[PDB]
Amino acid sequence: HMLSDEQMQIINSLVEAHHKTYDDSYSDFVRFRPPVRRLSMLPHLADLVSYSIQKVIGFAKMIPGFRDLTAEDQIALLKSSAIEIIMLRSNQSFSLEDMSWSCGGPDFKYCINDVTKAGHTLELLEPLVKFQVGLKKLKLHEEEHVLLMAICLLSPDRPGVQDHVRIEALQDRLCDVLQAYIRIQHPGGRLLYAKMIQKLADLRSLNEEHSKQYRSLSFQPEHSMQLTPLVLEVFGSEV
Amino acid sequence: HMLSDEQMQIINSLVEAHHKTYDDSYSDFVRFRPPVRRLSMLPHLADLVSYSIQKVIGFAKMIPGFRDLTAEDQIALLKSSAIEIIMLRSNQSFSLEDMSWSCGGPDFKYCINDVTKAGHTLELLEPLVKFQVGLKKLKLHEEEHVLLMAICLLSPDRPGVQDHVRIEALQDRLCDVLQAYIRIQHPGGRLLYAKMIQKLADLRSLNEEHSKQYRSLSFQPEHSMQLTPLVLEVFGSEV
Amino acid sequence: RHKILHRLLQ
Amino acid sequence: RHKILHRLLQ
Numbered sequence A, B: 001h002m003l004s005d006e007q008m009q010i011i012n013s014l015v016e017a018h019h020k021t022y023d024d025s026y027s028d029f030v031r032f033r034p035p036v037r038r039l040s041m042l043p044h045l046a047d048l049v050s051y052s053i054q055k056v057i058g059f060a061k062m063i064p065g066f067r068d069l070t071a072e073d074q075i076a077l078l079k080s081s082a083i084e085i086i087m088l089r090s091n092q093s094f095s096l097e098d099m100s101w102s103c104g105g106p107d108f109k110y111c112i113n114d115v116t117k118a119g120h121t122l123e124l125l126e127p128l129v130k131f132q133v134g135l136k137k138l139k140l141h142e143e144e145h146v147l148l149m150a151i152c153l154l155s156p157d158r159p160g161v162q163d164h165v166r167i168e169a170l171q172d173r174l175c176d177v178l179q180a181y182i183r184i185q186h187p188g189g190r191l192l193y194a195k196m197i198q199k200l201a202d203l204r205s206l207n208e209e210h211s212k213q214y215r216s217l218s219f220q221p222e223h224s225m226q227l228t229p230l231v232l233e234v235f236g237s238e239v
Numbered sequence C, D: 001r002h003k004i005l006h007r008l009l010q
């Protein structure tokens, strides 16, 4: 039992799409407004998040089948899953050692206390780290990590999605490649699939909590003014 | 012939208001997105401009009589004159020697070529510098420079102004202090007043040109996304 | 809108 | 609106 051309081709695409949109050296972080340690980290983290959304969009545009959806659904899937994809890809910089996202020097080393100064509370930050840790422990292959992100982004159950039937199909196709892959290429991965699909659920809670906390933040003009047009658009409530 | 209490008090207020909202060391510039030398300077200059609008607002709120206008007129006067006030106060950093705005090191030294990389053309940049030079040559006192800015901001002829009659009055009162001051405290200042009022006219042209160039820029989402919420709001066309 | 301007003007 | 998102998606 082994992978098929179509499946494997979907893997070369996602892994290439990820490499093309994720720098393991975080060299672009100096172009962000400097981090500062009432919401002093907000400017820098807003720029980090905005930067990441741009990358998620680049990645999405290269997930097989996504480019064919209507512009509306692409936006619906993007707006709704953006924050989850960010949390996923962020794991790649997370460190179980220092329980933080290490992106270079002491400057770009992000701790919970840091996100607290960007307007977020432990209510969100607690499970975030808990999730980061659990996800790290899965020691996922790049193929499974990139597949989990493509799968999460094509979740058919997102507010605003129209053609939720095709979306549901593309997601299943991917869910299939991930399953085959784990079985064929990943040892002891007998129960990994379930753990990966489980992770998607934890993301909805984190997503929801973030939505609330972000809503409050965005309502206060002295704070929303620190955000970027893209963040305001992707997380905003405009229909 | 000498100044009166009321007049002189208006001067202590404006000069204090300016000091409280203008740092001659430009120490906050490091918190802006770094400058970079297709519109690479846009991020840094957007942050410079946004930063300056916040300062102009702080200054405006301290111009005598402004705090009494309706919130709408304050906004109308602000939206319409913001860019002109910026150009005025910027002179304080302009250097006739290097024909630029020197705000620290080679980084924060702004040349025309720089504003070109922020989306603006010589059509605007040419008169800007020409204006900067002419204004510099006036070797204005801080009292006259701060008065010229308060006067410019209370221009009754701004699109959107409602109670244009009271505005017109506050402006005249200021125009009076500036006149008295020049006569009493400024030698050879016999023809300075006319030169100062003349400067207000050059600002309308610069303002107009900027409005056009900014409009084009703002229409291109790949560019407006580099702007800040405040810039989009103050220069935007929302009614 | 002018939500930000309104706020900045206290 | 979603003018920015539209554009980024080419």
Ligand SMILES: C=C1/C(=C\C=C2/CCC[C@]3(C)[C@@H](C#CC#CC(C)(C)O)CC[C@@H]23)C[C@@H](O)C[C@@H]1O
Pocket: A042, A045, A046, A048, A049, A052, A086, A087, A089, A090, A091, A092, A093, A094, A101, A103, A110, A115, A118, A119, A213, A214, A217, A231
């Ligand atoms: C964003 C990323 C990184 C870390 C993630 C973090 C570290 C800092 C705080 C973040 C970005 C959290 C947040 C937020 C927020 C917000 C606003 C917009 C203020 O509501 C989610 C993930 C957290 C670093 C790198 O792996 C790339 C990835 O794209």
Ligand SMILES: C=C1/C(=C\C=C2/CCC[C@]3(C)[C@@H](C#CC#CC(C)(C)O)CC[C@@H]23)C[C@@H](O)C[C@@H]1O
Pocket: B042, B045, B046, B048, B049, B052, B086, B087, B089, B090, B091, B092, B093, B094, B101, B103, B110, B115, B118, B119, B213, B214, B217, B231
């Ligand atoms: C802004 C200021 C300074 C220089 C002004 C410049 C130097 C760089 C380019 C500017 C800021 C010009 C512009 C612009 C623009 C624009 C967008 C928003 C992109 O359309 C106007 C005055 C020019 C420096 C200092 O004196 C404080 C003052 O508040």
